[PDB]
Design an enzyme around this catalytic site. Structure first.
Site, short mmCIF file in Angstrom:
data_model
loop_
_atom_site.label_atom_id
_atom_site.label_comp_id
_atom_site.label_asym_id
_atom_site.label_seq_id
_atom_site.Cartn_x
_atom_site.Cartn_y
_atom_site.Cartn_z
CD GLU A 106 9.17 2.96 -3.16
OE1 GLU A 106 8.66 3.69 -3.78
OE2 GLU A 106 10.67 2.53 -2.99
CB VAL A 107 8.88 3.87 3.61
CG1 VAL A 107 9.54 4.85 4.54
CG2 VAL A 107 7.46 3.49 3.76
CE1 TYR B 242 -3.74 -2.73 0.35
CE2 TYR B 242 -2.83 -3.19 2.33
CZ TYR B 242 -4.27 -3.20 1.73
OH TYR B 242 -4.36 -4.11 1.86
CG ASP C 270 1.09 -4.96 11.05
OD1 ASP C 270 1.63 -6.56 11.05
OD2 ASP C 270 1.30 -4.40 9.84
CE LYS D 162 2.36 3.94 5.17
NZ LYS D 162 1.68 3.26 6.69
#
Ligand SMILES: Brc1nc2nc[nH]c2c(Br)c1Br
Length: 325
Positions: A47-48, A45, A151, A63
């Site tokens: 990319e950092v 979902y 998470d 992010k």
């Protein structure tokens, strides 16, 4: 059916706008203030990137949100706003967009993270107590704010082992807890999924995060990382049952009237509950104490409602050396 023992009314006692994230309207600043420097990771979902704010030279993490429901974006943004200033929760600096494409991104404080795979083989007894206490502060805070992370895992616990700084990151799966609500069980990482998820029990709560924390504690004190290493979601429950016991699993299912997918009949076998001391060996024995084992036993329990809360865990004697210091 099932209810959290703590924080069950947090959201209902607050203004609707606190939890009604679909109604939240973020203020989107200008991503052009940020220069991307290096890729730090990717998920399905987002990319950092490490980045620099060119207006003030601040190093940050950006992010960039990609195949992300607008509803899921609002959820994450509102949760991060509600958690502002929370102890050891990653600080959201701003919500920004590419001013042309309108693709949204989140700007976070930078943390110089120590690779967990290497770190978890060199922690001292005090280090484990210290970092687990720091992570518990974050979980007690978010739970007290009516939010489950869903998470918790080493990859979402940034640790700067030089400055002794810990931050709980990646709130993209987090949700508001409302009593009796049924939630999607397709959350958390395999090795950190609580038994409730693995048996398709939807009426779960903050205690899911305490299972995941227990998995991390076990990996640190015993140095088996991950501690429960399933090959798939079915095998994950088998690996748990080989430690906690099969008769004990069935008593949990009976208590909550949980239906068990019949594929499990041919793989669970029959297993006695194991003593936690069975995991001690010459290389981990300096990390294991009676206190550690008592705490672990009270976290890694099938019955989510009988696991310690984050606050109860923080109060446990295992953390007395940390509090004293
Ligand atoms: Br937010 C955030 N996400 C990350 N993913 C990998 N490293 C990361 C760091 Br450092 C931060 Br801060």
């Amino acid at each position: 059916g099932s209810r959290a023992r703590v924080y069950a009314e947090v959201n209902s006692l607050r203004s609707r706008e606190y939890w009604d994230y679909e109604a939240h309207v973020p203020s989107w600043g200008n991503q052009d203030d940020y220069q991307l420097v290096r890729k730090l990771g990717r998920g399905k979902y987002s990319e950092v990137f490490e980045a620099i704010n060119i207006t003030n030279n601040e190093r940050v993490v950006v992010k960039i949100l990609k195949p992300v429901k607008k509803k899921k974006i609002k959820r994450e943004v509102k949760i991060l706003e509600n958690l502002r200033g929370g102890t050891n929760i990653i600080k959201l600096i701003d919500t920004v967009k590419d001013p042309v494409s309108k693709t949204p991104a989140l700007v976070f404080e930078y943390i110089n993270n120590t690779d967990f795979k290497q770190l978890y083989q060199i922690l001292t007894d005090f280090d484990i107590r210290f970092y687990m206490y720091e992570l518990l502060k974050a979980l007690d805070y978010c739970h007290s704010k009516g939010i489950m992370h869903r998470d918790v895992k080493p990859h979402n616990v940034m640790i700067d082992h030089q400055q002794k700084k810990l931050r709980l990151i990646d709130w993209g799966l987090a949700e508001f807890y409302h009593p009796a609500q049924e939630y999607n069980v397709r959350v958390a990482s395999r090795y950190f999924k609580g038994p409730e998820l693995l048996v398709d029990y939807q009426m779960y709560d903050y205690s899911l995060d305490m299972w995941s924390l227990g998995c991390m504690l076990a990996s640190m004190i015993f140095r088996r990382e991950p501690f429960f290493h399933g090959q798939d979601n079915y095998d994950q429950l088998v690996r748990i049952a080989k430690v906690l016991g099969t008769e004990e699993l069935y008593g949990y299912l009976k208590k909550y009237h949980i239906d068990l997918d019949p594929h499990f009949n041919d793989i669970l076998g029959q297993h006695s509950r194991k003593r936690w001391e069975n995991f001690i060996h010459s290389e981990n024995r300096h990390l294991v104490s009676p206190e550690a084992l008592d705490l672990l036993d009270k976290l890694l329990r099938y019955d989510h409602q009988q696991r310690l809360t984050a606050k109860e865990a923080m109060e446990h004697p295992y953390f007395y050396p940390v509090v004293k210091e």
